[PDB]
Amino acid sequence: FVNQHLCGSHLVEALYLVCGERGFFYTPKT
Amino acid sequence: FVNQHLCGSHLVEALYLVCGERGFFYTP
Amino acid sequence: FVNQHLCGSHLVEALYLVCGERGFFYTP
Amino acid sequence: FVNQHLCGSHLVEALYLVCGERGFFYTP
Amino acid sequence: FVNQHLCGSHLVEALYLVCGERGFFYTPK
Amino acid sequence: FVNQHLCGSHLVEALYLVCGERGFFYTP
Amino acid sequence: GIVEQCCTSICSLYQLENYCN
Amino acid sequence: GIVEQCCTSICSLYQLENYCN
Amino acid sequence: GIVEQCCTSICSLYQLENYCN
Amino acid sequence: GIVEQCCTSICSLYQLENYCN
Amino acid sequence: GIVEQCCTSICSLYQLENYCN
Amino acid sequence: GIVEQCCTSICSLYQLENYCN
Ligand SMILES: Oc1cccc(O)c1
Ligand SMILES: Oc1cccc(O)c1
Ligand SMILES: Oc1cccc(O)c1
Ligand SMILES: Oc1cccc(O)c1
Ligand SMILES: Oc1cccc(O)c1
Ligand SMILES: Oc1cccc(O)c1
Ligand SMILES: [Cl-]
Ligand SMILES: [Cl-]
Ligand SMILES: [Zn+2]
Ligand SMILES: [Zn+2]
């Protein structure tokens, strides 16, 4: 739903900060 | 200046939207 | 309300990316 | 240009905030 | 749902813009 | 200038995340 | 308007182009 | 403070100005 | 206009208000 | 997944790190 | 990788798709 | 301050956590 869609966008930006140069894997998969 | 890090931050947001449920690796 | 306010904030971003050089109108 | 692409993304966010219900055109 | 957290995320971006060179404190709870 | 303006916008977001419950002062 | 279409349901990028100039 | 004031009903830019340094 | 005027130089929220309908 | 666990309540730093590569 | 491809000239959404899973 | 520190080179999490209250 729209909530989780808006939330995912903040998750990806936190992952970007957290993981730094490691990078990361974003998967919305349940 | 810290430009590619700011850029990477917009790039991951753009990928979020384009990739959808597929998702993505972000590998610098 | 706020839910709508944050939503629009992310819509405007998505519209900025998809619309490109053409641009967009944002009128709630 | 990416610097301009990054800048317009923040501009669009600031206009969204500034213009409230009035909305706005973004026309590069 | 993490609504306060998302909310504060936009709050601090609005404060960044409203407060310009004066800056701000963000002191949650 | 503009680049510091775009950067600080990111720093504020990053401080938000990092500082969690404690919060933060942004001074430019 | 756009808030009824897209805040109440996810507008994909393809749908979002209806709102371009 | 600000979360309580601003997270269900929209605060105008002018209301947010109270939280500036 | 906006990009030229606001990406070389920082526009206040005040001057951004010109671009509001 | 990350959504059902991080969106319903706040994820810790270490929980986020799960997704680092 | 992507930073090199995409941080001087704008990668379109099309080109960004290449980085998807 | 932070702009001088962190807009010239990338600040780590530990560096940024210097500006937390
Ligand atoms: O339907 C929506 C709502 C908010 C952001 C977005 O990309 C799509
Ligand atoms: O009430 C709020 C919440 C988030 C951003 C904003 O400008 C206002
Ligand atoms: O002049 C500008 C450029 C980008 C965002 C902003 O708030 C102001
Ligand atoms: O649990 C969450 C959800 C969104 C952003 C974040 O840092 C944590
Ligand atoms: O090439 C780029 C760089 C940053 C964001 C974007 O959407 C495209
Ligand atoms: O040095 C920086 C600049 C901007 C965001 C950030 O997390 C770090
Ligand atoms: Cl949000
Ligand atoms: Cl930027
Ligand atoms: Zn948001
Ligand atoms: Zn930016």
Side-chain angles (χ1 to χ4, degrees), chain E residues 4 7-8 11 14-15 18-19 22-27 29, chain H residues 1-4 6-8 11 13-14 16-17 19-21:
Chain E
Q4 294 164 253
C7 179
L11 280 169
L15 298 181
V18 164
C19 295
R22 289 186 279 160
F24 54 106
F25 268 97
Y26 186 75
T27 330
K29 298 212 73 156
Chain H
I2 188 174
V3 167
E4 3 306 296
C6 296
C7 292
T8 69
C11 291
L13 266 29
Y14 155 72
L16 294 161
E17 166 206 301
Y19 304 92
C20 301
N21 255 308

Side-chain angles (χ1 to χ4, degrees), chain I:
Chain I
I2 193 185
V3 164
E4 87 172 40
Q5 159 87 36
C6 291
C7 289
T8 64
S9 204
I10 300 161
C11 291
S12 61
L13 303 181
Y14 184 88
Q15 154 181 200
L16 285 166
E17 253 175 20
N18 303 355
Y19 306 90
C20 302
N21 287 50

Side-chain angles (χ1 to χ4, degrees), chain B residues 2-28:
Chain B
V2 86
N3 287 352
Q4 78 211 249
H5 177 83
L6 299 176
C7 177
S9 159
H10 297 271
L11 275 170
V12 296
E13 187 49 50
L15 290 175
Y16 175 67
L17 295 162
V18 172
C19 300
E21 67 187 1
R22 281 194 282 169
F24 66 86
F25 290 92
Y26 170 80
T27 51

Side-chain angles (χ1 to χ4, degrees), chain A residues 2-17:
Chain A
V2 161
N3 262 10
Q4 284 69 51
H5 184 75
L6 301 170
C7 179
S9 160
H10 297 264
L11 284 168
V12 153
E13 178 58 50
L15 290 182
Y16 183 75
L17 180 68

